[PDB]
CSV table of C-alpha atoms and ligand atoms in Angstrom, one decimal:
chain,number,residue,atom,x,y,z
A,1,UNK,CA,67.4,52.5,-11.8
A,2,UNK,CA,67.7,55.8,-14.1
A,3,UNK,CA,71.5,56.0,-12.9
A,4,UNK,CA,71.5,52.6,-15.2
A,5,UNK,CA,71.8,52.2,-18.6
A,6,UNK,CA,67.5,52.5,-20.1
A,7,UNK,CA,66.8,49.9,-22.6
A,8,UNK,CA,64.4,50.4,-25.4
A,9,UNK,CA,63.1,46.7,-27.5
A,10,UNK,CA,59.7,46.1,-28.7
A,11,UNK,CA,58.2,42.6,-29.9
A,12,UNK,CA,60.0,40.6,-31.3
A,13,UNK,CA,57.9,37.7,-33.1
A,14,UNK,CA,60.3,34.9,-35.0
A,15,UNK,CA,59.1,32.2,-37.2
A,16,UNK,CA,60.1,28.4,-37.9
A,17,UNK,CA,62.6,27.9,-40.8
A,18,UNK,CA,63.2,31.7,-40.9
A,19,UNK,CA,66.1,34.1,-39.9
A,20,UNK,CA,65.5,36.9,-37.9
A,21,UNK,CA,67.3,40.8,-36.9
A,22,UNK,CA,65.9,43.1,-34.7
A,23,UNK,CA,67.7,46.0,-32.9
A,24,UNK,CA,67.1,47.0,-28.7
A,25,UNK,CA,68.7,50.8,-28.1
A,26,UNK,CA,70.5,51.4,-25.1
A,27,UNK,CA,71.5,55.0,-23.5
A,28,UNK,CA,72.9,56.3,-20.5
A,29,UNK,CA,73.3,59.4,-18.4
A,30,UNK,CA,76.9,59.3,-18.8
A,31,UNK,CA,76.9,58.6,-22.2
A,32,UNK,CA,78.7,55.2,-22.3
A,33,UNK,CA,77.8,51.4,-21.8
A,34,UNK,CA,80.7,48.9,-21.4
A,35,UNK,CA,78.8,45.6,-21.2
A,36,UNK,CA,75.5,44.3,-22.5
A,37,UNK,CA,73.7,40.7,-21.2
A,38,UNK,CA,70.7,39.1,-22.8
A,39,UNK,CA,69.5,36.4,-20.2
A,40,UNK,CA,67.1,34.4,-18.7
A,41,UNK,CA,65.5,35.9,-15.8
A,42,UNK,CA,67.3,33.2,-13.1
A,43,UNK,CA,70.6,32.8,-11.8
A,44,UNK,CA,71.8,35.9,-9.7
A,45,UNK,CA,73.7,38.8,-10.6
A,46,UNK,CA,76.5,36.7,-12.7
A,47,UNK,CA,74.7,35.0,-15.1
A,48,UNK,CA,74.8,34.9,-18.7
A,49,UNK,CA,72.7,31.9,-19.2
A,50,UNK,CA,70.3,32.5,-22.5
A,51,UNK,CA,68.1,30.1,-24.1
A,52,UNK,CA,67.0,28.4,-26.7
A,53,UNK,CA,70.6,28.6,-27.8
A,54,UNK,CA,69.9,29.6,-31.1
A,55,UNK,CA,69.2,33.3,-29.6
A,56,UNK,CA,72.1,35.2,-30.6
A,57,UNK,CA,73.5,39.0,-30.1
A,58,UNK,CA,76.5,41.3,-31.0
A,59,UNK,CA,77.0,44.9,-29.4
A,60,UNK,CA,79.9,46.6,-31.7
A,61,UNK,CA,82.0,49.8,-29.9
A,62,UNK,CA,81.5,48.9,-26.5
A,63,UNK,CA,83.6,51.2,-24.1
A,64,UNK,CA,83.6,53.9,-25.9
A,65,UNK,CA,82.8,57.2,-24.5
A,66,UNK,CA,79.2,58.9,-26.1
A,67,UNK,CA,78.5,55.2,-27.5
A,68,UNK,CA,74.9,55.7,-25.7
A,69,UNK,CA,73.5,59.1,-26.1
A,70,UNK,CA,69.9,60.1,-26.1
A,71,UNK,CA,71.3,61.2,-30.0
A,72,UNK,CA,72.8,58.3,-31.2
A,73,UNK,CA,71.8,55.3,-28.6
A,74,UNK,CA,74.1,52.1,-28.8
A,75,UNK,CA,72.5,49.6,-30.7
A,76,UNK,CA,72.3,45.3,-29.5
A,77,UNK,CA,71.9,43.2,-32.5
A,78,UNK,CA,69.7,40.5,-31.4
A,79,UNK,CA,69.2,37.4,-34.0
A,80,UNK,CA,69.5,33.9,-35.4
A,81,UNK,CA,68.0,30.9,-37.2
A,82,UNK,CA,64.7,29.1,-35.7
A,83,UNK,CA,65.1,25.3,-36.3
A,84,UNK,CA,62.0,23.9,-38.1
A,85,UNK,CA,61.6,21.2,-35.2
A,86,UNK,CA,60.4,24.3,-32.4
A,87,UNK,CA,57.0,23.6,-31.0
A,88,UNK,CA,54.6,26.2,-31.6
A,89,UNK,CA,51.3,27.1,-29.6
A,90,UNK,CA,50.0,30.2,-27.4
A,91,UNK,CA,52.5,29.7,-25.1
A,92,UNK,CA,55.9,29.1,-27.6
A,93,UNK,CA,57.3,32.5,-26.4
A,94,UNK,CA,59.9,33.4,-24.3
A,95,UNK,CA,60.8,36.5,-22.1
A,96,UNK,CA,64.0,37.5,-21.8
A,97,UNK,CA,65.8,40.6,-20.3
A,98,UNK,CA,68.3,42.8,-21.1
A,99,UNK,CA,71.2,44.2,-19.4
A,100,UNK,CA,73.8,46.9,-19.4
A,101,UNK,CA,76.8,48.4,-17.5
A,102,UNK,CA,78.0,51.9,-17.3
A,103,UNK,CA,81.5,52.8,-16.4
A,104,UNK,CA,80.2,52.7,-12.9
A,105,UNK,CA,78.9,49.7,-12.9
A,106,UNK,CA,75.6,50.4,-12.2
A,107,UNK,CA,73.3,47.6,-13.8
A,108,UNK,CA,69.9,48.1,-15.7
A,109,UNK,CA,67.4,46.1,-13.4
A,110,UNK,CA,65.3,43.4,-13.9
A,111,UNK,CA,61.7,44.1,-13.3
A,112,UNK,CA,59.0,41.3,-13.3
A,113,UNK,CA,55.8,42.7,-15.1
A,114,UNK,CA,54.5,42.6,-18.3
A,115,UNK,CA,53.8,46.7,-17.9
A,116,UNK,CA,57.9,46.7,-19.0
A,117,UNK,CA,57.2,45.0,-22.0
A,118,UNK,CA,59.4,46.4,-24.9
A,119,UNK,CA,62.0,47.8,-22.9
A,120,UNK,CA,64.7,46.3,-20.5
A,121,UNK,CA,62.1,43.7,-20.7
A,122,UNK,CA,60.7,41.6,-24.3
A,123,UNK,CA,59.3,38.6,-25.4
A,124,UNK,CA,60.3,36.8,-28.0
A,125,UNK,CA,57.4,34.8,-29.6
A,126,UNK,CA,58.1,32.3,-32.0
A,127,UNK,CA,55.2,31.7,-34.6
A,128,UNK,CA,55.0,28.9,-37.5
A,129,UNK,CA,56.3,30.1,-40.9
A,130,UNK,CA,53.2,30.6,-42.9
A,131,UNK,CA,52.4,33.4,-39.6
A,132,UNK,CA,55.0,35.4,-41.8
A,133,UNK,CA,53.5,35.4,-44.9
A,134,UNK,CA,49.9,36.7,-46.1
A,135,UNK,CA,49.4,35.6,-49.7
A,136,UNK,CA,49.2,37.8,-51.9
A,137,UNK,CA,45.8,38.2,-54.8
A,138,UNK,CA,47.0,36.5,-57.7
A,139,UNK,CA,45.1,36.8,-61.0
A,140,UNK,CA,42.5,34.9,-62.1
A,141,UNK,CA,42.5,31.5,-63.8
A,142,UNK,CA,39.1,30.9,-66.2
A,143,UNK,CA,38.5,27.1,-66.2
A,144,UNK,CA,36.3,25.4,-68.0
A,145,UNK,CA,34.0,23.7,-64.9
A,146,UNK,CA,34.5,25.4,-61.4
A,147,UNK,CA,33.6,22.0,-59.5
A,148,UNK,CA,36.5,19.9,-62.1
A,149,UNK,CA,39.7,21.4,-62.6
A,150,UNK,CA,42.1,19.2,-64.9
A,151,UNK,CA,45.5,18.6,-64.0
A,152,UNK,CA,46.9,21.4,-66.4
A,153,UNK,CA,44.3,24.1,-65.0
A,154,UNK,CA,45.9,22.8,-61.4
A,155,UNK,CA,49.3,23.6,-62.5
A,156,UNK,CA,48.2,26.9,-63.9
A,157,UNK,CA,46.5,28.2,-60.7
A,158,UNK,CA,49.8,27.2,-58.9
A,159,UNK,CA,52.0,29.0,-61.2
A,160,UNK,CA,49.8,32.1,-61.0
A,161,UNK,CA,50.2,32.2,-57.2
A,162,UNK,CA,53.5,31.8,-57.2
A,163,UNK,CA,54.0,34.4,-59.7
A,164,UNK,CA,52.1,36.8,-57.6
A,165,UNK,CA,54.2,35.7,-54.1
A,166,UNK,CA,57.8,36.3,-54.9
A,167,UNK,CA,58.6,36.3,-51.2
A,168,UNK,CA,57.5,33.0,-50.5
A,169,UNK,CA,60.0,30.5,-49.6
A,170,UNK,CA,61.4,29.1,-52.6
A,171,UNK,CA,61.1,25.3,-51.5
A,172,UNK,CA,57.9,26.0,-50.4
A,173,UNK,CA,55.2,23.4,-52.1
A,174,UNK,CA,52.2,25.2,-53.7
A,175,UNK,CA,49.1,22.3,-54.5
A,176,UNK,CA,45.3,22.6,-56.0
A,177,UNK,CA,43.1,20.9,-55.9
A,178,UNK,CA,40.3,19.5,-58.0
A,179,UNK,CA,37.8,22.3,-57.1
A,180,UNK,CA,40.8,24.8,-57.2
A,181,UNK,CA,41.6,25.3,-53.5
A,182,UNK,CA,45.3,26.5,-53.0
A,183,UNK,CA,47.2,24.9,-50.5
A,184,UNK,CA,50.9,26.4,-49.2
A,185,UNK,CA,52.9,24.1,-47.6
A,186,UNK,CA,56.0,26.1,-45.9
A,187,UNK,CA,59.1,24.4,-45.2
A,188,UNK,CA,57.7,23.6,-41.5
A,189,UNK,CA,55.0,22.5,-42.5
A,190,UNK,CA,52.8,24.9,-41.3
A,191,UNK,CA,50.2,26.1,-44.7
A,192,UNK,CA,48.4,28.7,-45.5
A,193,UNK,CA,44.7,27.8,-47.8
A,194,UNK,CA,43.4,30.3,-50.6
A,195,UNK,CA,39.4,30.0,-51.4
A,196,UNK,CA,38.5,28.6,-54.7
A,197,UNK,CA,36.6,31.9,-55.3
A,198,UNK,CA,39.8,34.2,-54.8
A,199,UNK,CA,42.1,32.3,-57.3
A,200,UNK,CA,39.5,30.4,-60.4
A,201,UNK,CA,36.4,31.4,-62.1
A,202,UNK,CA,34.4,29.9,-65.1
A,203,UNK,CA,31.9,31.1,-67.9
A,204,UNK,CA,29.1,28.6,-66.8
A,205,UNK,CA,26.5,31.0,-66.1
A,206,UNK,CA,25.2,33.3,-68.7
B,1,LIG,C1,62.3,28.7,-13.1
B,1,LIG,C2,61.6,29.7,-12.3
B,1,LIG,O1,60.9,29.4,-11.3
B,1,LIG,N1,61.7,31.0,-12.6
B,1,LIG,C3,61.1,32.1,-11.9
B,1,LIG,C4,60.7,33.1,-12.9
B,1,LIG,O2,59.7,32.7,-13.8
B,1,LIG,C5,59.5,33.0,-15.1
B,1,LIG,O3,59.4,34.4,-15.1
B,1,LIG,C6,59.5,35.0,-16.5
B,1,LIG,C7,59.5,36.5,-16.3
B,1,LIG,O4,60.6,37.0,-15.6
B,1,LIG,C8,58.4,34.4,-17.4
B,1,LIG,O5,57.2,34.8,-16.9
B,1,LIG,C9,58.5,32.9,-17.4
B,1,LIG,O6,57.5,32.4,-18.3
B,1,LIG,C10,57.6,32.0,-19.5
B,1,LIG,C11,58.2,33.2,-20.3
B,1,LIG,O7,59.4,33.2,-20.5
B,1,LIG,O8,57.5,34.0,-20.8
B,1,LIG,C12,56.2,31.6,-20.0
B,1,LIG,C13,56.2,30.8,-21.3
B,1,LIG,O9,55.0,30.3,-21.7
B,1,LIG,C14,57.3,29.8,-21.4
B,1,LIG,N2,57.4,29.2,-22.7
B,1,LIG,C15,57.4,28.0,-23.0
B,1,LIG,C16,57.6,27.6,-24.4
B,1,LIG,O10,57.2,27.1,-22.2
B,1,LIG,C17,58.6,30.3,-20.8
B,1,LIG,C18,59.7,29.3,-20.8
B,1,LIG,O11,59.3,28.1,-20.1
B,1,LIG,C19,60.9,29.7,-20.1
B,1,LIG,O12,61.1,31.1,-20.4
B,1,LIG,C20,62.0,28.9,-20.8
B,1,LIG,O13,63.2,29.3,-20.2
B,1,LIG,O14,58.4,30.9,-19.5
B,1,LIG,C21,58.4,32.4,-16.0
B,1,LIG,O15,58.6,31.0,-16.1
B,1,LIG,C22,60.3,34.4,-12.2
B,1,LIG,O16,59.1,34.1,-11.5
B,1,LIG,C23,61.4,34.9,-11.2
B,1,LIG,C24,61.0,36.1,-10.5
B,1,LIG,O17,61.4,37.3,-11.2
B,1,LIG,O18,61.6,33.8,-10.3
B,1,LIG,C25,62.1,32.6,-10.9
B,1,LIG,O19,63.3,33.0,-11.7
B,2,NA,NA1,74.6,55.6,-15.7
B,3,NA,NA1,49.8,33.1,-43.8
């Protein structure tokens, strides 16, 4: 319907424990939008029905005129908090569609096909916590024997990734083992594993 308001998303990946923003633009031919919708696909032209209900949105200056030009689009807030208890596999995504009204009333349309992925149309994945986080090189820790680590050269190899992941959650729990493997455990639960190699070396060989 190019009479309707276009739509313009993209992919919007979320992650347990973790807040997320992103921003859809929306223009029109007649340069003004007076209602957005961010729904499921079911329940006829009246619905408003979105979930999970943590999925949350805000359109500021609606029905204004020139609020969506090709210049200076309208912009949907779409965000929220994912709950740590949110299952997680190759299907733990959702797609949703978006919807706007001109003064006329004409309505974007909702299209079924993935080819309109990242406009009217998105999907909102939702990914464990340690998918947002790629751990960083830290410096390396000399032991004394690669295949013994003591308990203070366990607490040093910690400290060293932490001090070179300042992004990392905060709470999250950060644990070596005796042959220096790094473990992250992120507030879900989810971890993330460092190779012994990448983090420890010794002066055993000459
Ligand atoms: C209830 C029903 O029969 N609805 C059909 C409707 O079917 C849905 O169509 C969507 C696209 O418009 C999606 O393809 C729906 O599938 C998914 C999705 O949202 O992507 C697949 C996911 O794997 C799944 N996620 C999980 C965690 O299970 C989700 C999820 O179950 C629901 O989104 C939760 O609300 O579903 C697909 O189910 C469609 O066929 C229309 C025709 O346009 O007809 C009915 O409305
Ligand atoms: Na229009
Ligand atoms: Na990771």
């Amino acid at each position: 319907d190019t009479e309707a308001p276009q739509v313009k998303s993209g992919d919007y990946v979320v992650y347990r424990g973790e807040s997320f923003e992103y921003y859809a633009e929306i223009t029109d031919n007649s340069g003004q939008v007076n209602r957005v919708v961010i729904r499921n696909v079911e329940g006829g032209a009246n619905s408003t029905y979105l979930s999970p209900n943590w999925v949350k949105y805000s359109t500021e200056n609606l029905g204004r005129p020139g609020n969506a030009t090709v210049q200076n689009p309208l912009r949907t807030r779409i965000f929220g908090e994912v709950p740590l208890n949110e299952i997680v596999n190759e299907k733990s995504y959702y797609t949703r569609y978006i919807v706007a009204w001109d003064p006329s009333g004409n309505a974007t349309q909702m299209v079924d096909n993935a080819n309109r992925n990242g406009l009217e149309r998105f999907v909102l994945t939702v990914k464990s916590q340690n998918e947002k986080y790629d751990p960083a090189e830290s410096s390396v820790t000399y032991v004394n024997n690669l295949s013994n680590l003591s308990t203070s050269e366990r607490e040093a190899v910690a400290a060293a990734v932490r001090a070179a992941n300042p992004n990392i959650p905060p709470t999250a729990k950060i644990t070596v083992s005796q042959n220096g493997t790094v473990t992250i455990t992120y507030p879900d639960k989810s971890t993330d594993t460092i190779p012994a190699n990448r983090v420890v070396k010794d002066l055993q060989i000459s």
